[PDB]
Amino acid sequence: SSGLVPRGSHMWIGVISLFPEMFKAITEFGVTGRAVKHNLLKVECWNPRDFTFDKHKTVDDRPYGGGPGMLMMVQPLRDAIHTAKAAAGEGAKVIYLSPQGRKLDQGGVTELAQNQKLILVCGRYEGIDERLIQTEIDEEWSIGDYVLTGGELPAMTLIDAVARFIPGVLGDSFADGLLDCPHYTRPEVLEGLTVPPVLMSGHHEEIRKWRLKQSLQRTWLRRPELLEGLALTDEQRKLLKEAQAEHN
Amino acid sequence: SSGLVPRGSHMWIGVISLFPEMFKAITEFGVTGRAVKHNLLKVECWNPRDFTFDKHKTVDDRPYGGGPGMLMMVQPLRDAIHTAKAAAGEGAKVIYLSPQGRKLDQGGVTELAQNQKLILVCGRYEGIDERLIQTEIDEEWSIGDYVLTGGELPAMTLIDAVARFIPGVLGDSFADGLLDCPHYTRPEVLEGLTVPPVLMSGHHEEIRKWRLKQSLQRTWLRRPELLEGLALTDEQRKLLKEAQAEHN
Ligand SMILES: NCc1ccc(CNc2ccc(C(N)=O)cn2)cc1
Ligand SMILES: NCc1ccc(CNc2ccc(C(N)=O)cn2)cc1
DSSP, X not given: OOOSSOOTTOEEEEEEOSOGGGGHHXXXXXXXXHHHHTTSEEEEEEOGGGGOOSTXXXXXXXXXXXXXXXXXXXXXXXXXXXXXXXXXXXTXXXXXEEEEEEEOOHHHHHHHTTOSEEEEEOOBTTOOOHHHHHXXXXXXXXXXXXXXXXSHHHHHHHHHHHHTTSTTSOOOOSGGGXXXXXXXXXXXXXXXXXXXXXXXXXXXXXXXXXHHHHHHHHHHHHOTHHHHTOOOOHHXXXXXXXXXXXXX | OOOSSOOTTOEEEEXXXXXXXXXXXXXXXXXXXXXXXXXSEEEEEEOGGGGOXXXXXXXXXXXXXXXXXXXXXXXXXXXXXXXHHHHHOTTOXXXXXXXXXXXXOHHHHHHHTTOSEXXXXXXXTTOOOHHHHHHHOSEEEESSSSOOSBSHXXXXXXXHHHHTTSTTSOOOOSGGGSOOOOOXXXXXXXXXXXXXXXXXXXXXXXXXXXXXXXXXXXXXXXXXXXXXXXXXXXXXXXXXHHHHHHHO
16 A cells, blocks of 8 residues: 555445445546545445355345345345455444435534444345344444435445545535535626626625625525524624525 | 337436446446336436537636636536437426435435436536526435535436336335334344244234334334324324333
């Protein structure tokens, strides 16, 4: 392991997945791809398929009590987890991604990003045996109240979200707990819509206050529950009241 | 376009992305990969890079009013959107994935899945010009209250979630508005933990009621706000009260 890029806060993420090639979407492209090449982020996959012993490499099994779907077969999945934990050494927290988990939000991303090592277990079918949660999983997390064909997209979502908090990965995330303000680039006029003159003014302080007021107004109109989680600054209370008066 | 697999409800999804190779994670693997091969789901990508005219194929641009980040360059992105809309023909709703969007949940997935054609616009950098939202985007959606390096993982998350509602894709999603019950597979005993005897009984009705009670108990302990959105059946009111009495 070598290179010139400061990597003091580098993260290691082990992944248990039946489809490790999915992870190329994050390891080979964009900002996450650069993090991996610069050794700020390492993503290491184990496939339960490689832990099977039968001729057909069976990775699913029938649920007790019947019902329609399959579960991940215990022995191959358990063996893959044990191999990832041995590789990771001490301090690796094991995360299972499921709709039954703790709801991920940006605060939870920053809590997760304090871990120098994670193992992300990706369930396929109707998920994993309850007893493996009890014996192998440190924390269960959901990316949101929907059901996907597997935990791989949730795992990749968490990796990407945490990676942004690794110093050096980026070249301001829900700034102030608010929805982000509108942004504008060239051209000055688009389908008769003009860039707000304040953004053209060069007045750094008036621009700051316009963006903060817009963020407060958009949070209030779209996601008012997000305001209730906040103790607004004096300046923020005044800009919201001005945006609420102007709306009315 | 041909094949034997019933595809009456087939979905077409256009995608605008600087990294269309990311979409292989859904189009080449698992249940979504099978949907694509069977013509239940088509995913068609346009890359704004192919709509550039400068020697360096520039796809970012500086925000008006300064600040740290870049935006997607308007002309290449707008041209890619127009080409996707012409390809899609009439009835294609254009979705922009952003943290400022409507929060996706399973109900919203099923609303989105009523569309036979979607175009998913994937923003990189600090996102897209506000005026393109106004002029090109039908609906803005978030997959959750976190910030990612791009809209591609959110787009792939929505495709996967909607695909499950396409008849024939699957071989019961938040059944009853509740968190799913525990599942068990072989072996009968794992690290001294035994499968609940009821699941071994063959008694289809007692198994149904045990799984419903567990789902009510887990929703109540982990996500009690989910119970408030529900008008529980008589049977559900009785099983929750029994689980709440047994907890206490
Ligand atoms: N029956 C439980 C179960 C467990 C695991 C799966 C795999 N797919 C997932 C995993 C996580 C999420 C999420 N919202 O973070 C969504 N879909 C499905 C079902
Ligand atoms: N500054 C606004 C903005 C817009 C678009 C992006 C691209 N990344 C995204 C897109 C969608 C989501 C989400 N939660 O669904 C998360 N991250 C970033 C920033």
